[PDB]
């Protein structure tokens, strides 16, 4: 529940484009603490540090046996995604519409 994850992160599938208006990134976690919280932290092209909305149930990684699903209300324009601590950190460039 508490401190965020320390391991690496890895997307296992499609980053669907739900027509309601969201990206639904599915990931699997290879790391130290297995019942952590997921370090999701979307940002803009510069890093004034935030740009995007988190739509999932406020999720956590409780397995390595189970791929953590994620939903996020991105902005209809160029933008960077992010998942995981500094080393081996997912840095998706969802900068599309």
């Amino acid at each position: 529940s508490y401190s965020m994850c320390t391991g690496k992160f890895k997307v296992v599938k499609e980053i669907a484009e739900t027509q309601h208006g969201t990206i639904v990134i599915r990931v699997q976690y290879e790391g130290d603490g297995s019942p952590c919280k997921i370090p999701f932290e979307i940002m803009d092209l510069e890093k004034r540090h935030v740009l995007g909305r988190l739509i999932t149930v406020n999720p956590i990684v409780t397995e390595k046996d189970s791929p953590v699903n994620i939903e996020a209300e991105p902005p209809f324009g160029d933008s960077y995604i992010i998942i995981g601590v500094e080393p081996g950190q997912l840095k998706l460039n969802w900068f599309k519409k």
Partner: antibody, heavy 116, light 112 residues
Framework: EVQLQQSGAELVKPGASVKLSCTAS????????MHWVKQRPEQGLEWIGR????????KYDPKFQGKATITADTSSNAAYLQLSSLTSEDTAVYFC?????????WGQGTLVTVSS | DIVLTQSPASLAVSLGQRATISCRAS??????????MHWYQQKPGQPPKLLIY???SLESGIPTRFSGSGSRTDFTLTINPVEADDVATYYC?????????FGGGTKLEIKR
């Protein structure tokens, strides 16, 4: 823990079909993509196709679109592989893997020989 | 189509220095801003083993010098402490545009 178990190792007469299969250990099949890579004598691996237990959608490498047909079952935690109308050298160890980013857990290759 | 060029054809390394392998795709593999070039290490009679997933990240639990180096469509695998463990053909595979196929491979030979 985790890992895939393909079935047997059969010998099939030319002009017949085989029904390979991969199975789960500690993860649901809908979890991620699952494939079928083919490998002969020394001609290193050849990705055949991926399938999605979730959607149920599978895309192949054109030049394989006529032989194979990947499948899955959630009842059973397995993804199969129908390879038909085979030829004399349509012979290889047909493997099955897991990920999207680099394949992590592969199964005990299943060798298939087409013979008379 | 999409095409890979793993180039050392077959090399014989020492038992203590930098094993250098390379793979050169034709079209680009930079997907989510991240290039999708992965490596494998298949030994005799066994299935392939994933070294590097995205061009430079090192796997679940694989010995340290094994690392990626690469661009939108041009890469290379490395192993410095080449040891009596690393005897295999190494692979190179793409996962961006559907022909998610692998190269030809390279048969590392370690001297003793």
């Amino acid at each position: 823990e985790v890992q895939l178990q393909q079935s047997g190792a059969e010998l099939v007469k030319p002009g017949a079909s085989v029904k390979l299969s991969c199975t789960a250990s500690g993860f649901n099949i809908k979890d991620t993509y699952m494939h079928w890579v083919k490998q002969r004598p020394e001609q290193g691996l050849e990705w055949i196709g991926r399938i999605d237990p979730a959607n149920g959608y599978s895309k192949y490498d054109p030049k394989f679109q006529g032989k194979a047909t990947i499948t899955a079952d959630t009842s059973s935690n397995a993804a199969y592989l129908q390879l038909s109308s085979l030829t004399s050298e349509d012979t290889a160890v047909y493997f099955c893997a897991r990920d999207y980013e680099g394949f992590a857990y592969w199964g005990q290759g299943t060798l298939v020989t087409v013979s008379s | 189509d999409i095409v890979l060029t793993q180039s050392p054809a077959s090399l014989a390394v020492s038992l203590g220095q930098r094993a250098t392998i390379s793979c050169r795709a034709s079209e680009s593999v930079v997907r989510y801003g991240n290039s999708f070039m992965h490596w494998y290490q298949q030994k005799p009679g066994q299935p392939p083993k994933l070294l590097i997933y995205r061009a430079s990240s090192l796997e679940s639990g694989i010995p340290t010098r094994f690392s990626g180096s690469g661009s939108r469509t041009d890469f290379t695998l490395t192993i410095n402490p080449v040891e009596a463990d690393d005897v295999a053909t190494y692979y190179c595979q793409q996962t961006n545009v559907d022909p998610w196929a692998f190269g030809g491979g390279t048969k590392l030979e370690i001297k003793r």
